């Protein structure tokens, strides 16, 4: 069962209006994830919304955000061919494998913070970073998916969730992120959540008091970094750019200081990939238009896939 250049393999998620199939690209043999979406049943507002996500997926180009590779589209159906993070969610990972040494925890936090910062540079995020947004790929690299998206086209309140959200106030930016980001680190480095309890009333009591103990192996840099994230009043919280500069963030990176992400100049002329595509049947004009005009068609999708994994 194929769509376009993709052999569809197992289903990995159904949701109301979307189905994510794992798949293999028959030209290059890359594994990808294909989100199949019925568009026949969509009121105009769901359609407007569908197409906004698509625009955003189109511009997110980051080594730690899931890439979009191809859009194949009929009157009835939208297929979005996207990067596959084979490794699950980061919270599960920790629950399943325990804490990480600071060095691995940093590499992952670096990727996270940079991806979250970058999203903000690129669109306006209207909802909180969520556990289901933090994935790992086959090589333990972070990949953020759908940051700030509705879950219409997805497939009480969380332990990993700003204290002021337990006050009912809507998401207001890199401010709520910072708290979440603090819970991530706490767990990344300690294996356990910084706040918990039996039920809604223990969790909330705990979170809003915001006391936590650190484990004795956590380094002072790390504890210090945490003192900038897990902070009750949202205005006392470090900005993302300010977080990037923290000491713990840069241990081992004293030359390569963490910095807001800037997209490199895109390479549309990789001669290796082009030679392969010419051997495959594609024309050099075809490759180039596809690339410069970002069509997300069979051709552009091929050149991208030839560049990974």
XYZ file of C-alpha atoms in Angstrom:
309
model
C 0.000 0.000 0.000
C 1.761 3.166 -1.286
C 1.194 6.903 -1.435
C 3.439 8.836 -3.768
C 6.999 7.530 -3.243
C 6.190 5.953 0.138
C 5.531 2.401 1.161
C 3.325 2.504 4.171
C 4.176 0.204 7.032
C 2.614 -0.036 10.517
C 0.144 2.507 11.959
C 1.728 4.186 14.958
C -1.226 6.406 16.085
C -4.828 7.157 15.201
C -6.517 10.300 16.415
C -9.768 11.839 15.555
C -8.894 13.311 12.220
C -5.365 12.197 11.658
C -3.532 8.941 11.277
C 0.204 8.585 11.488
C 1.683 5.748 9.561
C 5.304 4.789 9.683
C 6.714 4.504 6.092
C 9.626 3.987 3.874
C 10.703 6.249 1.012
C 11.202 3.946 -1.977
C 13.638 6.178 -3.797
C 16.199 6.563 -0.956
C 15.067 4.047 1.528
C 14.690 6.538 4.389
C 12.203 5.800 7.163
C 9.704 8.556 7.645
C 6.383 9.208 9.463
C 3.310 10.000 7.251
C 0.373 11.912 8.878
C -2.692 11.069 6.813
C -5.532 13.597 7.298
C -9.064 13.366 5.943
C -9.987 16.773 4.727
C -13.505 15.777 3.455
C -14.982 16.217 6.922
C -13.504 19.537 7.968
C -15.403 22.669 8.720
C -13.775 25.811 7.327
C -12.145 26.620 10.594
C -10.483 23.219 10.948
C -9.267 23.586 7.408
C -7.878 27.125 8.076
C -6.184 25.632 11.047
C -4.836 22.599 9.256
C -3.210 24.866 6.761
C -1.586 27.064 9.373
C 0.131 24.164 11.027
C 1.322 23.135 7.556
C 2.819 26.591 7.000
C 4.602 26.432 10.256
C 5.951 22.919 9.648
C 7.229 24.195 6.324
C 9.625 26.800 8.037
C 10.835 24.978 11.070
C 14.330 24.039 10.043
C 16.196 22.895 13.145
C 18.332 19.884 14.009
C 15.976 19.346 17.024
C 12.571 19.953 15.585
C 10.936 17.360 13.404
C 11.540 18.214 9.792
C 8.774 18.185 7.179
C 9.879 16.436 3.984
C 7.025 16.345 1.503
C 3.351 17.262 1.207
C 1.309 15.038 -1.059
C -2.297 16.320 -1.370
C -5.511 15.429 -3.159
C -8.969 17.044 -2.919
C -9.890 14.627 -0.211
C -6.643 13.993 1.770
C -3.508 15.583 3.072
C -0.336 13.513 3.564
C 2.492 15.252 5.495
C 5.690 13.255 5.210
C 7.825 14.095 8.223
C 10.767 13.050 10.272
C 10.305 10.016 12.437
C 11.528 10.102 16.049
C 11.786 6.333 16.748
C 12.663 6.799 20.408
C 9.518 7.948 22.304
C 8.982 10.815 24.752
C 11.633 12.109 27.054
C 9.528 11.722 30.140
C 8.921 8.057 29.349
C 12.574 7.623 28.648
C 13.535 8.880 32.092
C 10.803 6.813 33.786
C 12.171 3.846 31.883
C 15.903 4.386 32.237
C 16.443 6.633 35.230
C 18.447 9.741 35.515
C 21.148 10.790 33.059
C 24.681 11.964 34.057
C 24.936 15.747 33.826
C 26.888 15.560 30.616
C 24.164 13.672 28.722
C 21.555 15.810 30.480
C 23.194 18.955 29.191
C 23.430 17.702 25.638
C 19.727 17.015 25.680
C 18.870 20.309 27.494
C 20.934 22.216 25.046
C 19.043 20.744 22.160
C 15.704 21.363 23.945
C 16.289 24.964 24.899
C 17.587 25.847 21.518
C 14.722 24.240 19.786
C 12.135 26.005 22.044
C 13.854 29.353 21.617
C 13.990 28.888 17.942
C 10.274 28.091 17.571
C 9.592 31.439 19.131
C 11.790 33.231 16.641
C 9.675 31.529 13.964
C 6.000 31.568 14.848
C 3.825 32.583 17.754
C 3.355 29.785 20.167
C -0.059 29.731 21.859
C 0.197 26.643 24.206
C 2.523 25.126 26.652
C 5.415 22.870 25.938
C 3.907 19.437 26.553
C 5.400 16.066 27.263
C 4.114 14.656 23.990
C 6.140 17.431 22.289
C 9.544 16.151 23.544
C 10.733 13.163 21.557
C 14.013 11.309 20.996
C 15.233 9.874 17.733
C 17.054 6.593 17.193
C 20.313 8.300 18.274
C 18.989 9.893 21.443
C 18.765 13.413 19.781
C 15.862 15.647 20.867
C 13.140 16.322 18.384
C 10.311 18.769 19.350
C 7.064 18.096 17.451
C 4.054 20.318 17.240
C 5.151 22.924 19.881
C 2.200 25.177 20.619
C -0.258 23.271 18.334
C -3.925 22.452 18.856
C -4.556 18.816 19.112
C -7.279 18.625 16.602
C -4.800 16.930 14.189
C -2.995 15.157 16.982
C -2.783 11.367 17.162
C -6.282 16.992 35.644
C -3.101 18.959 34.836
C 0.393 17.522 34.224
C 3.214 17.085 36.785
C 5.364 19.151 34.177
C 3.249 22.303 34.060
C 3.675 25.960 35.245
C 2.290 26.761 38.745
C 0.270 29.708 37.347
C -1.531 27.299 34.944
C -2.889 25.820 38.206
C -4.085 29.374 38.728
C -6.199 29.101 35.448
C -4.368 31.941 33.488
C -3.776 31.200 29.675
C -0.279 30.521 28.187
C 1.746 33.803 27.928
C 5.114 32.781 26.470
C 8.837 31.904 27.100
C 7.754 32.587 30.675
C 5.720 29.427 31.172
C 8.241 27.516 29.103
C 10.893 28.359 31.611
C 9.098 26.603 34.426
C 8.465 23.492 32.372
C 12.036 23.641 31.210
C 13.008 23.501 34.877
C 10.986 20.348 35.522
C 12.547 18.746 32.498
C 16.057 19.402 33.864
C 15.184 18.283 37.325
C 14.031 15.036 35.926
C 16.744 14.698 33.371
C 19.304 14.990 36.095
C 17.578 13.188 38.940
C 15.272 10.654 37.369
C 12.336 11.734 39.471
C 9.817 14.677 39.134
C 10.467 17.675 41.275
C 6.824 17.851 42.348
C 4.440 15.185 43.146
C 1.759 13.634 45.372
C -1.108 11.109 45.385
C -3.711 13.307 43.609
C -4.699 16.682 42.229
C -4.721 18.190 45.770
C -1.167 16.989 46.776
C 0.363 17.903 43.376
C -1.065 21.411 43.305
C -0.358 22.093 47.016
C 3.238 20.940 46.282
C 3.792 22.803 43.014
C 2.390 26.120 44.344
C 4.610 25.866 47.449
C 7.443 25.121 44.989
C 9.882 23.664 47.529
C 11.869 20.744 46.298
C 15.006 18.970 47.507
C 17.829 18.260 45.188
C 19.670 14.977 45.140
C 23.202 15.102 46.611
C 24.990 14.260 43.279
C 23.405 17.215 41.418
C 26.248 19.702 40.866
C 26.080 23.274 42.159
C 26.002 24.672 38.564
C 22.992 22.461 37.939
C 21.292 23.464 41.126
C 21.998 27.093 40.353
C 20.518 26.684 36.819
C 17.442 25.135 38.376
C 17.129 28.106 40.720
C 16.446 30.257 37.600
C 13.796 27.925 36.138
C 11.823 26.528 38.955
C 10.858 29.850 40.353
C 7.387 30.629 41.522
C 6.821 34.154 40.362
C 6.853 34.042 36.571
C 8.448 37.403 36.216
C 11.560 36.373 38.244
C 12.262 33.635 35.628
C 15.218 33.745 33.280
C 14.349 34.457 29.636
C 15.358 31.783 27.175
C 18.306 33.846 26.025
C 19.350 34.420 29.559
C 19.010 30.581 30.207
C 21.317 29.894 27.237
C 24.025 31.775 28.915
C 23.810 29.855 32.275
C 27.007 28.227 33.562
C 25.685 24.724 33.681
C 24.509 25.084 30.081
C 28.054 25.811 28.924
C 30.223 23.398 30.847
C 32.377 21.908 28.063
C 31.335 24.613 25.587
C 33.522 27.544 26.762
C 34.342 28.308 23.027
C 30.945 27.197 21.507
C 28.721 29.249 23.895
C 25.027 28.382 23.521
C 23.268 31.011 21.478
C 19.942 31.536 19.848
C 19.781 29.310 16.735
C 20.310 30.818 13.289
C 19.483 28.681 10.205
C 22.541 28.029 8.005
C 22.421 29.025 4.330
C 20.689 26.291 2.648
C 22.799 23.984 0.497
C 20.888 23.287 -2.698
C 23.883 22.399 -4.611
C 25.276 19.351 -2.979
C 26.782 17.816 -5.988
C 26.718 14.305 -4.496
C 23.025 14.460 -3.970
C 22.410 16.094 -7.289
C 24.491 13.455 -9.186
C 22.406 10.820 -7.488
C 19.181 12.475 -8.514
C 20.330 12.964 -12.035
C 21.224 9.281 -12.148
C 17.644 8.655 -10.813
C 15.853 10.544 -13.567
C 15.496 14.016 -12.222
C 16.642 17.044 -14.116
C 18.990 19.660 -12.649
C 16.434 22.440 -13.440
C 13.810 20.390 -11.715
C 15.985 19.943 -8.627
C 16.792 23.586 -8.314
C 13.287 25.015 -8.701
C 11.963 22.520 -6.317
C 14.579 23.670 -3.817
C 14.551 27.485 -4.278
C 10.744 27.626 -4.381
C 10.407 25.183 -1.500
C 7.753 23.061 -3.180
C 7.842 20.033 -0.774
C 7.202 17.757 -3.754
C 8.699 14.403 -4.714
C 11.937 16.125 -5.883
C 12.673 18.363 -2.970
C 11.721 15.544 -0.642
C 14.264 13.285 -2.311
C 17.177 15.762 -1.988
C 16.401 16.205 1.736
C 16.082 12.521 2.416
C 19.354 11.824 0.579
C 20.938 14.117 3.195
C 20.011 12.012 6.292
C 20.399 8.808 8.213
